[PDB]
Design a protein around this ligand. Structure first.
Ligand SMILES: Cc1ncc(COP(=O)(O)O)c(CNN[C@@](C)(Cc2ccc(O)c(O)c2)C(=O)O)c1O
Ligand SMILES: Cc1ncc(COP(=O)(O)O)c(CNN[C@@](C)(Cc2ccc(O)c(O)c2)C(=O)O)c1O
Lengths: 465, 465
């Protein structure tokens, strides 16, 4: 293609995208295809001569869309939201056009420099302690990671290098491998699987701290684990404290866990992948209190701050602690990959085109809708809410057996009107209702509950026979 | 933004992108800004109320573009090409609109299933051994990684897990840490820094194999290193053999190194980040002979196959060896991150809109232009070519001291008409000329050489005084 043909086809793509978005409520949210559906429907080899754009876009509708789960349908209530906004889409077109690989300052100065400023913009919107901000001064700063899973790995690796160097400074004869045998990392029993994966990749032991009745990590359980493992000869070195657990959006107590991690020389990484976006609202900022004790803090604008994937935001207090693993000129030693694209354009466009107040309104509407769903559940005594509703997630279930709730879930996902996923809280099977779509409204939440309520009656009937 | 506003602004963005691309030859390839230029030019905090699109796009031109290194200018001859094509741009708009996170089959079936087919399309274009292809049969298959640096890490981690399990099967009392002390990985002394980083992240020793006069890894040097390290008690477990080294586009000998790695139970990873795209042309496929001995093979469509970053293509012979670290339903255990976007749409669009013959013509034009530059250098006896020219890279220098070539480079990069970077080959400072832009032509290559030739005269004059 030349640029003149892209002028025509790019504008046709813009219309196609806007059409898909404007009609998305008419899409079945979860697909009917079975695993393996796609390969029989397209050729076994690439074409030798070019295909037409018309044939390709026809295949998008005919072959791709039947296998799409529509994350941005208002009836998608699964997992956590992922971001979809037109400002991020516009920036992503510009990002691909500039097309730089920012593995060094010289590879495109603006790619690195805009990113550092946007991470300070974001840090200030979250009212982060100044130690995390760059502002061309001090030792802290922020970087975009590809994902919170990668951000957790990066923090673990930095923590690993820091403790190896400290332990070898104390015992110069001590090998890296002898230290490796004794290192242990911690997270909540509600932590995301990215923590377990970081421990496996990092080659260290990982232990779950039992959570309290609110599924929060507390000082007492942490102290009990530390006493046990230190007596066994393990060396605590890394902690992931979670704000907004994937299971039930619970919150680890940083005011309790922070001081303990500091005094134990445990690198404290705060994972707020989903919940972090709400901390731009002052009524939720208290859930972040204690981040001043953290060594690193991470959350995903690409979940709940309208910056399309990929965009994970990570700050550290000491750049030097992170690199070994004022002006920031490159990010090579802040991330796993060397190459990176101009992702800060997406943050710039979203922040500027929505404004801080526009993002706050977006968060608050989602939380209000969550409370609307919760209100409906609390009116039906056949159901129970298992965890306090704070952000855009409601954990609910039919009172009674796990089997009846497994049946309810299977009826919901078989009817394919809405989409949600479950979790386990201890031995209890629980349904999750996550407010996801940028365009979801009260009417969608109410119809989803009406649907759930109807299927529950059929399921409860079948259990008495 | 709503969809109706995106219809208007998205089409204005398409025009802006096409304008930038059509005028790109008028851009100064390398910028005049100094590190730190950007922060004083934009506000210290995000705006509370929205800014206009017009103000944002004005800032792109006023503030961002002065800090852009124009990778896609025809006068960019630095590093290696990165991909920029309009089919990939169109697919990337559709990718952001579908906006799924494909961390599981259910999160969007098409996101995983198209990817597996495209990796077979690509594998067949490279005439890979069938053991690497999926085709819903056997044990092999391919995945998109975010980068070759990540692909190398993933292979090292899989190799690490495989050798730990084998050594523990032989000695059940042996701890992971005791094994960690003895593991050693290998690469060429010309290997990319991503290998050293994978070794650091993976917690294993890494040793460089001395390259021959053609900067290739050969059996003799590999055998000499193996005898030394095995006698010292090290356990060889991982090898990165490079096809198309970053320094001088040299090629490790897989026909020699492959059988050695197999008999030593060394996981052989073939890194062809840049050169791999040329292997779709039969006249270059012989440079890949011996990949049948590899356990994993990787190259970057986002360098030299017009699939905009990010898109790194990695194949393995045994999915089970990779996951522990027929139908493919998820890629969670193939990559470092859990989340991933619908990147295979970019491969689909590029492959279909260019056709295999269009991609072959693109490769061959770049190689011809490389040989055109080489021809000009070989006509000037003040210069020498340090390594055989095979693909789109020419390694050249003024005969004489490193200091005179350092002066030549500084004059080139100070005049800001073209952009190139150097390397070291042993103790020798060498200039690299890489054919990069999709729209580069003979006329650009000839003007670049005319420029280099002129600056060399001034530099040689200043050395005789
Ligand atoms: C609490 C928590 N911590 C870390 C991560 C990992 O984030 P990332 O995907 O960027 O590596 C998560 C992941 N949330 N995983 C979900 C909710 C799936 C998901 C939804 C929306 C997204 O934008 C992403 O990236 C993932 C899951 O089902 O596991 C997390 O919740
Ligand atoms: C031989 C070789 N192996 C691995 C890598 C790493 O690839 P990736 O960037 O995907 O992690 C490379 C990297 N090449 N690095 C260049 C040539 C910079 C560069 C140019 C164009 C790109 O598309 C990327 O991603 C990077 C460098 O200067 O180091 C490699 O050459």
């Amino acid at each position: 293609m030349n640029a003149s043909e892209f002028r025509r086809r790019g504008k046709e793509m813009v219309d196609y995208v806007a059409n898909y978005m404007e009609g998305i409520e008419g899409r079945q949210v979860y697909p009917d295809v079975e695993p393996g559906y796609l390969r029989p429907l397209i050729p076994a080899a690439a074409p030798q001569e070019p295909d037409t754009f018309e044939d390709i876009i026809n295949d998008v509708e005919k072959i791709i869309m039947p296998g799409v789960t529509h994350w941005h349908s208002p009836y998608f209530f699964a997992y956590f939201p992922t971001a979809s906004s037109y400002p991020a889409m516009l920036a992503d077109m510009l990002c691909g056009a500039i097309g730089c690989i920012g593995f060094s300052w010289a590879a495109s100065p603006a790619c690195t420099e805009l990113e550092t400023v946007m991470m300070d913009w974001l840090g200030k919107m979250l009212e982060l302690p100044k130690a995390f901000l760059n502002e061309k001064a001090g030792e802290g700063g922020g970087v975009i990671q590809g994902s919170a899973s990668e951000a957790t790995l990066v923090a673990l690796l930095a923590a690993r290098t820091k403790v190896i160097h400290r332990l070898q400074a104390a015992s110069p004869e001590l090998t890296q491998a002898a230290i490796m045998e004794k290192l242990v990392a911690y997270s909540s029993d509600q932590a995301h699987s990215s923590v377990e994966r970081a421990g496996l990749i990092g080659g260290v032991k990982l232990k779950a701290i039992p959570s309290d009745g609110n599924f929060a990590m507390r000082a007492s359980a942490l102290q009990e684990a530390l006493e046990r493992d230190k007596a066994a000869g393990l060396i605590p070195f890394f902690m992931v404290a979670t704000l907004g657990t994937t299971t039930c959006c619970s919150f680890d107590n940083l005011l309790e866990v922070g001081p303990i991690c500091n005094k134990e020389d445990i690198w404290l990484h705060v994972d707020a992948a989903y919940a972090g976006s709400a901390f731009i609202c002052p009524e939720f900022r208290h859930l972040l209190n204690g981040v001043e004790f953290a060594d690193s803090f991470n959350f995903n604008p690409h979940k709940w701050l309208l910056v399309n994937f990929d965009c994970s935001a990570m700050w550290v207090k000491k750049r030097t602690d992170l690199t070994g693993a004022g002006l920031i000129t490159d990010y090579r030693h802040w991330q796993i990959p060397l190459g990176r694209r101009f992702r800060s354009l997406k943050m710039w466009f979203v922040f500027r085109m929505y404004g801080v107040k526009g993002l706050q309104a977006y968060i608050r509407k989602h939380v209000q809708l969550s409370h609307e769903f919760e209100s409906l559940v609390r009116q039906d005594p056949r159901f129970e809410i298992c965890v306090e509703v704070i952000l855009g997630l409601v954990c609910f279930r039919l009172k009674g057996s796990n089997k009846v709730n497994e049946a309810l879930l299977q009826r919901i996902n078989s009817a394919k009107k809405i989409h949600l996923v479950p979790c386990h809280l201890r031995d209890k099977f629980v349904l999750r209702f996550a407010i996801c779509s940028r365009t979801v409204e009260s009417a969608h939440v109410q119809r989803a509950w009406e649907h759930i309520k109807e299927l529950a009656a059929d399921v409860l009937r079948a259990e008495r026979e």
